[PDB]
Amino acid sequence: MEYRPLGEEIERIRKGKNIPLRVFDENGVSSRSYQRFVQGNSELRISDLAIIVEILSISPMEMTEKLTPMSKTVLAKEQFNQAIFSKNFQESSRIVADYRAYYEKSSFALGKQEVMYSMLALEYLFNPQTVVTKEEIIALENQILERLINADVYTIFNLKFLALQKNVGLQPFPTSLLFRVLQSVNEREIIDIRSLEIIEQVIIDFLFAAIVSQNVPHILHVLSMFKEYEVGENNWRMILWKKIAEKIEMILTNEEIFADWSIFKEQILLSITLFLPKAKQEFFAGQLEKIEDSLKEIKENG
Amino acid sequence: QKEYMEYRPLGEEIERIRKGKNIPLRVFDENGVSSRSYQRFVQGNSELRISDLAIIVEILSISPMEMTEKLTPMSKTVLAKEQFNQAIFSKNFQESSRIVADYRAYYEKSSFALGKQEVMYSMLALEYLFNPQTVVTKEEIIALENQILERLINADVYTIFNLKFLALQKNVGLQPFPTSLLFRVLQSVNEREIIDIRSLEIIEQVIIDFLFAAIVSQNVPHILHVLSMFKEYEVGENNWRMILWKKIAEKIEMILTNEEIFADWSIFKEQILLSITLFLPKAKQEFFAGQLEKIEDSLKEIKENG
Secondary structure, three states, X not given: OOOHHHHHHHHHHHHHOOOXXXXXXXXXXXXXXHHHHHOOOOOOXXXXXXXXXXXXXXXXXXXXXXXXXXXXXXXXXXXXHHHHHOOXXXXXXXXXXXXXXXXXXXXXXXXXXXXXXXXXXHHHHHOOOOOOOHHXXXXXXXXXXXXXXXXXXXXXXXXXXXXXXXXXXXXXXOHHHHHHHHHHXXXXXXXXXXXXXXXXXXXXHHHHHHHHHOOHHHHHHHHHHHHHOOOOOOOHHHHHHHHHHHHHHHHHOOOOOHHHHHHHHHHHHHHOOXXXXXXXXXXXXXXXXXXXXXXXXXXXXX | OXXXXXXXXXXXXXXXXXXXXXXXXXXXXXXXXXXXXXXXXXXXXXXXXXXXXXXXXXXXXXXXXXXXXXXXXXXXXXHHHHHHXXXXXXXXXXXXXXXXXXXXXXXXXXXXXXXXXXXXXXXXXXXXXXXOOOOOOHHHHHXXXXXXXXXXXXXXXXXXXXXXXHHXXXXXXXXXXXXXXXXXXXXXXXXXXXXXXXXXXHHHHHHHHHHHXXXXXXXXXXXXXXXXXHHHOOOOOOOHHHHHHHHHHHHHHHHHOOOOOHHHHHHHHHHHHHHOOOOOOHHHHHHHHHHHHHHHHHHHHHXXXX
């Protein structure tokens, strides 16, 4: 049984904090069942675990990659991810074939479906002698897309799916769907740094692409969404993007002049020397230039 | 015997996702999870097992992170701490003081848990700090404080709530601050990959306060210990605020080690002050500027003393 990361980590805390097993029994929790849980044996109940994190004064958020369970799907995706990274492709293609069989015989699970698509997509993108076909990707893509369209709630993995779908680019990107996914995901407070990083990059890229497209109604739609996106006080990068978005709206609606844009852009270009290495600096600068050019064209061509 | 764990939020949230994703209860049974136990769980009845939950997050394609605050049970301790916090915030102090007295009784009769101990100290400390009509005495805060400190001295792993405890103990200031202990706690906590913005927010504020206080104290060996700690603290590329505090620490280092002069501080400070117009509202801008002012003055006193 795989919840071993969690049990091992709880063990590490308990022992590091000098808490003897008897305390668990004094609180209504079988030290035996707990021990069997640490190993690879029997099954703990959530209420037991909650009593344990209160005993050990653990914040549950604190448990990070320890809250994720180590199922066949999760382990498979871990292997395939590192394999693809290190470019050891014989492994990646064999993990794919194995998982294809497992999935086709397994009970239905959205996680399994999503990981299945992920494996096919990354194979198609990175293994130059891949067996997986465009057609297999598209059929599975359309199943996931159909569920997304008919759904009323979205989670972070639906956003990852859309990002991956844009990179695969075998079918046009569902922009309207991106709006709905962003809205449902950002209804809750995101506390996963990894999720925040995905959401931020998607929003920055979405606004940049909207601008270069010079489609004003769409740019305004993206800006209106960015207006509702909540940014923490300490998230200076996102604060700055919010300020850029604000200044862009004024320019688009004729309520700011390009001389003011120019002053603002120069301030930014100076300030990012504090925060960014040189390559990131020039990439950012280039983004500002292309945005400036797009706006010049929009306002010249009315 | 064991205490009741209120878990309807978790069940209601899993319900929300399942229904929002068009997953019929039948699918849970195809995957090894008793739909009947699950429904009993969504209600106010029986206890779900960890393995059932794991299967459910795979069915629903959930990142377990995505729940976090629903994975926490509404225990007497959790509800009490939530209540007391918001009561203290809105300055409605009749509430806070009665939550305190109740919890003290509950804690004194309860079985032992470090969590209960920590919340107990949090409540006494915030009463004493914020309720100008508090019943809580110094001596009680001190007794409990010393129990928690003793456990901290004897431990070899620390968690984020130990850090919160140290920040709060410095604020209470009824006893000297254990600076060596703060170094060990920061070290142990930052051994993990902290993935939670909430913990990151507490750690960042502690180390910023730690460096500001070190400078204000003008005690150079201590300051140098804090700067080398800062130098080793890892921050993501997109954490611009922390990028900047690392650079501030770096510049302070150079002036103290005679590899840059006060003029270099002044140039750097003005560049920062121009940049923070982009990131900070006026109030945060002025607070930040004031911190740079007090740092500069301290640096000038140190350099005219040595």
